[PDB]
Amino acid sequence: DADLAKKNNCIACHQVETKVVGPALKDIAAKYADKDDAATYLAGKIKGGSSGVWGQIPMPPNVNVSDADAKALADWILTLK
Ligand code: HEC
C-alpha cells in the first residue's frame, strides 16, 4: 500500500497517477494486467532492478526491501485502477 511504498522509499521516484522519475504506478498496473505471473515478475524487478522497459534510466535494485514486502508492493501496484 501507499504507506509501504513510502516506508520502502518508492515514492521518491513513483506516484500512483502520474509519471515522476519511474513510471506512474497505475501505468504499471495497466501494462501488466494480462500477464499471468505479473506479481512475481514485478517483485523480481523491485528486488533486482529494471532497465529498458520504460526508458534508459535504470531503477537500481532495492536492496533494503524484503521478499515479502517486494511481493506486497507488486500486488498493490497491480490493483491500481
Ligand atoms: C528512483 C531511484 C526509483 C526508485 C527509488 C524506485 N523506482 Fe521503480 N523504477 C524507477 C525507474 C526509473 C523505472 C523504469 C525502469 C525501466 O525498466 O525502464 C522503474 C521501474 C519500476 C517498475 C517496473 C518494472 C517493469 O519491468 O515494468 C516497478 C514495478 C517499480 N519500479 C517499483 C518500484 C518500487 C516498488 C519501489 C520501492 C521499493 C521503487 N520502484 C523504487 C525508478 C525508481
Instruction: Write the single-letter amino acid at 39.
Output: A
Q: Is 10 annotated as a binding residue?
A: yes
**Residue 25 CA, ligand 1 centroid: distance in Å:** 9
What does the alpha-carbon distance between residue 66 and residue 81 come to, in Å, rounded to a whole number?
Answer: 25
Domain range for residue 24? 1-81
Query: Is 39's C-beta closer than 6 angstroms to any atom of ligand 1?
Result: no
How many angstroms is it from 59 CA to the middle of ligand 1? 5
Domain containing residue 79: CATH number: 1.10.760.10
Q: How many domains does the chain have?
A: 1
Name 59's bridge partners: 50
Amino acid at 73: L
* Atom 34 (ligand 1) nearest CA: 10
Question: In the numeric block, which cell numbers belong to residue 79?
Answer: 490493483
What's the CA gap between 79 and 4, in Å, rounded?
15
Residue 5 CA, closest ligand 1 atom number: 37
Burial of 37 (0-12, 13-18, 19+ CB in 10 A): exposed
The answer to whether the CB of 20 is under 6 A from ligand 1 is no
> For this experimental structure, what is the resolution in angstroms?
1.6
